[PDB]
């Protein structure tokens, strides 16, 4: 009997059986309803397109993400996505397989309670367990200490763990992630002539960001160079022709992560939030966290982030301590790989929430010592 | 057939086989339970880290000394420490070896009774004996006369002995010791900005005290010198960088030994209690005690204590008598050396408390002539 490790996240759903190397099914987490009229009758027209189909027929659909910032805001779309994931992407009945969901830290409790209630009443799974999204990322590296910054697509959270003991009072969460970077890129692309407004084109802007953006090592000199020379201006092809040429917008959109004053947010960049979460920890385990910093999440896949982070942390941290930034090549699937490893352990077999316990205590069972 | 010379102490448990010159294992007497939550599974993390293993994980533990001032306040912790010492640090079964423990003078008798009862009931040792902590140090030096000042870590006592005869009526005990010096150093180090509150940082302050603090020959003169010159400015590297600068605080910590009014004590200093004890004994052996003054305990390893103490005693003593201070370099292990010597003596082979004697008279046999 294998275990199902689903990882909803916010933007990409990754699912696959426990004990594998890569998730078997990965697809964007969007539900797209049509908005036009429709004149041909009997064309097999559906009432809602979910999964990766909705970004293939995205011309006449209005894609609407069901998760804004970690929290789930539209439960009907989430139920649609879970149903499509179980029955059509893996074709496995949910009533004969345990489930391992992942939840961002410092989420509202109602989210977890409703997730448990839906998973136990609608899909009728035998037993499901919810885990913090960064602990599995740390599991993936094979270590037992370190501070992991899982800058996902919806929310960016920085969790330090030492010798398997997490520090709840030093968890730093910031709501700047890939979605706000995409929105800022779409806003600054109007400075050159191209205007994207409808939700269908936000996917195009997202693809442009994924394909062209890069994080500068130093910002001032690069900005000075890009405004004088012409070696950074790169071209891209839109899905109807009409090639565009992006200049200094390549490294200015990802710069927001290290300087959130662009979007008016109050907090500091991710290079200072990590140091602040480190300094909140006790004085004895700062050296080990300095030497064992770990990166994760899709949005940390930008070419040129591991060196900028190293330079900024070296600037902030004391000079004598050695600073190492772990960046595995498989950063995108690190959380799911950790979940697959966790679901295969023998000692984990008694941590699941038995359906009997839910029937006895209700959906609030998740908040108990049974996490 | 070999004898075990154990030294409980308070802070540094030292143990080893009899007849040697160095103890086998010297490790801190600390038992530290975890304090945080703990998220990673399968680490096999124990619920109690003791001894030297616990001083490597101080970040996620609450180190706690089971001995406040000589006496034992948590018998469960002391049982854990004894089990760890006998079974793991020596790899010697306790069932076929005698035991020689040490006790500070003028302590409650219930402590010795409970110690012997636990040693004979749980461990089932063949025979055990409790010896005075200072008489062993005096025996170790190869002499038989004089007054020994044993500035340990929990209790500081003065024991005068003449030609193998002790004087129970002239024993002066004060509870000022290295622990109070560490606390006072921590209290005064906040005047510059460096604040230590966590029980784990106490060990950092203790290491600072061991590596930096020293006894000034003249207190007021040195303090005036430090206010104008800058040769006392000493730098130290914290376990995470951010070096600190200690000025005149380095010789205020051991100045408490001579002026206990710093920590609120109404009693006199160490050089004065010894003088009072010497003047309390017979008038016929005062010169011999002057000629055989020997220091004991690790705390007497401060740089320059034997010179200021000699000067103070010479000033207080009559000008005719000659004052000499015997300061062996290995004063830290002197008690264990004395125990090793005593365990090897053939004349001492019949002073042990046999198992039959305990089964016949109970734990109260300790208070008898057989200590």
């Amino acid at each position: 009997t294998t275990a199902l490790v689903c990882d909803n996240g916010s933007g990409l759903v990754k699912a696959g059986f426990a004990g594998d190397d890569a998730p078997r099914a990965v697809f964007p987490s969007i539900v797209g309803r049509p908005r036009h009229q429709g004149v041909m009758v009997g064309m097999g027209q559906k009432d809602s397109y979910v999964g990766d189909e909705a970004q293939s027929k995205r011309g006449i659909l209005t894609l609407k993400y069901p998760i804004e910032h970690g929290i789930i805001t539209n439960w009907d779309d989430m139920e649609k996505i879970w149903h499509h994931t179980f029955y059509n992407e893996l074709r496995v009945a949910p009533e004969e397989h345990p489930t391992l969901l992942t939840e961002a830290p410092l989420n509202p409790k109602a989210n977890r309670e409703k997730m448990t209630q839906i998973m136990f009443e609608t899909f009728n799974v035998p037993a499901m367990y919810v885990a913090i999204q960064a602990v599995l990322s740390l599991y993936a590296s094979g270590r037992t200490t370190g501070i992991v910054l899982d800058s996902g697509d919806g929310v960016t959270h920085n969790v330090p763990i030492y010798e398997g003991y997490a520090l709840p009072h030093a968890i730093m969460r910031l709501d700047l992630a890939g979605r706000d970077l995409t929105d800022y890129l779409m806003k600054i692309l109007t400075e050159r002539g191209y205007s994207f407004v409808t939700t269908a084109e936000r996917e195009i802007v997202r693809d442009i960001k994924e394909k062209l953006c890069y994080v500068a090592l130093d910002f001032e000199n690069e900005m000075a160079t890009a405004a004088s020379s012409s070696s950074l201006e790169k071209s891209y092809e839109l899905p109807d022709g009409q090639v565009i040429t992006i200049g200094n917008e390549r490294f200015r959109c990802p710069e927001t992560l290290f300087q959130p004053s662009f979007i008016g947010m109050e907090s500091a960049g991710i290079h200072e939030t990590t140091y602040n979460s480190i300094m909140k920890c006790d004085i004895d385990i700062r050296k080990d966290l300095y030497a064992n910093n770990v990166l994760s999440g899709g949005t940390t896949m930008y070419p040129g982030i591991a060196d900028r982070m190293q330079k900024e942390i070296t600037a902030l941290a004391p000079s004598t301590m050695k600073i190492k930034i772990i960046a595995p090549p498989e950063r995108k699937y690190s959380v799911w790989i950790g979940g697959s490893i966790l679901a295969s352990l023998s000692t984990f077999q008694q941590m699941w929430i038995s359906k009997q316990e839910y029937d006895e205590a209700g959906p609030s069972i998740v908040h108990r010592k049974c996490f | 057939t070999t004898a075990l010379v154990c030294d409980n102490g308070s802070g540094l448990v030292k143990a080893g086989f009899a007849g040697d010159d160095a103890p086998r294992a010297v490790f801190p007497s600390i038992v530290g339970r975890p304090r945080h939550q703990g998220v990673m599974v399968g680490m096999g993390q124990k619920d109690s880290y003791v001894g030297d293993e616990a001083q490597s994980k101080r970040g996620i533990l609450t180190l706690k000394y089971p001995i406040e001032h000589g006496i034992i306040t948590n018998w469960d912790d002391m049982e854990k420490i004894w089990h760890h010492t006998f079974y793991n640090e020596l790899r010697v079964a306790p069932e076929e070896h005698p035991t020689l423990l040490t006790e500070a003078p003028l302590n409650p008798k219930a402590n010795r009774e409970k110690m012997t009862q636990i040693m004979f009931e749980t461990f089932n040792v063949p025979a055990m004996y409790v010896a005075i902590q200072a008489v062993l140090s005096l025996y170790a030096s190869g002499r038989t006369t004089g007054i020994v000042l044993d500035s340990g870590d929990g209790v500081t006592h003065n024991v005068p002995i003449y030609e193998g005869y002790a004087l129970p009526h002239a024993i002066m005990r004060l509870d000022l010791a290295g622990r109070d010096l560490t606390d006072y150093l921590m209290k005064i180090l906040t005047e510059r900005g460096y604040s230590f509150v966590t029980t784990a940082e106490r060990e950092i302050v203790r290491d600072i005290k061991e590596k930096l603090c020293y006894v000034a020959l003249d207190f007021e003169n040195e303090m005036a010198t430090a206010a104008s010159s800058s040769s006392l400015e000493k730098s130290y590297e914290l376990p995470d960088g951010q070096v600190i600068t200690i000025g005149n605080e380095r010789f205020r910590c051991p100045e408490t030994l001579f002026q206990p009014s710093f920590i609120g004590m109404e009693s006199a200093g160490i050089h004065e209690t010894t003088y009072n004890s010497i003047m309390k004994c017979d008038i016929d052996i005062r010169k011999d005690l002057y000629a055989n003054n020997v220091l004991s305990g690790g705390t007497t390893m401060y740089p320059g204590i034997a010179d200021r103490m000699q000067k103070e005693i010479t000033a207080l003593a009559p000008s005719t008598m000659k004052i000499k201070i015997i300061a062996p370099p290995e004063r830290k292990y002197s008690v264990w050396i004395g125990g090793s010597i005593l365990a090897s003596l053939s004349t001492f082979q019949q002073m042990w408390i046999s198992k039959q004697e305990y089964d016949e008279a109970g734990p109260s046999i300790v208070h008898r002539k057989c200590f």
């Binding site: 190397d21 993936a140 270590r143 490893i341 | 703990g38 998220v39 990673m40 599974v41 399968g42």
Partner: peptide, 20 residues
């Protein structure tokens, strides 16, 4: 209470090497 990890034995950091 937080998720009290049940008492097991081991292991880690061999899986990463195996995977690589």
């Amino acid at each position: 209470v937080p998720p009290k990890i049940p008492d097991g034995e081991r292991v880690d950091f061999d899986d990463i090497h195996r995977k690589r």
